[PDB]
Structure formats: C-alpha cells, structure tokens
C-alpha cells in the first residue's frame, strides 16, 4: 500500500527508534482541503 | 449502522468480487469541506 497517515500512527520520534528510516508519509486530507 | 466511507475499504473493483452489489456510501468529510 501507499504509506499514508491513515496507515500509520505516531509515537515518539526518530531519535528514539533504532532502525527507523527516512520516508514520506502521504496526507490524503491535504488535497481535499485544497479543492 | 449506515454504510459510510469509514465503514468500508477498497481493494480492487467490482469486476473482482463475485457477489458485490450496487449501493450508496456516505461521505462524512464532504459536508465539512462544503463549509
């Protein structure tokens, strides 16, 4: 699946989780608000 | 419980699921976008 904010949750940050990698998480709401 | 977009998910289409029917899904975001 495309990684989106609806497929993930957030807890803590990148200075805590070992093995965390850089990525982009897509927000489907943004274009709904823009249109 | 009325069928809404928060009660369903999409994977594939109507040419895939045998037994799938025409129906109406309510969008809870649309009326907010409208304001």
Curated annotation (Swiss-Prot), chains A, B:
Subunit of the fusion protein that is processed upon entry into the host cell. Mediates fusion of the virion and cellular membranes by functioning as a class I viral fusion protein. Contains a viral fusion peptide that is unmasked after S2 cleavage. This cleavage can occur at the cell membrane by host TMPRSS2 or during endocytosis by host CSTL. In either case, this triggers an extensive and irreversible conformational change that leads to fusion of the viral envelope with the cellular cytoplasmic membrane, releasing viral genomic RNA into the host cell cytoplasm. Changing residue 6 to H: In strain: Alpha/B.1.1.7. Glycans are attached at residue 22. It comes from the Viruses. It comes from Severe acute respiratory syndrome coronavirus 2 (2019-nCoV). The chain holds residues 1113 to 1147 of 1273 of the full protein. This is Spike protein S2'.
């Amino acid at each position: 699946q495309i990684i989106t904010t609806d497929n993930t949750f957030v807890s803590g940050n990148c200075d805590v989780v070992i093995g965390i990698v850089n990525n982009t998480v897509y927000d489907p709401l943004q274009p709904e608000l823009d249109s």
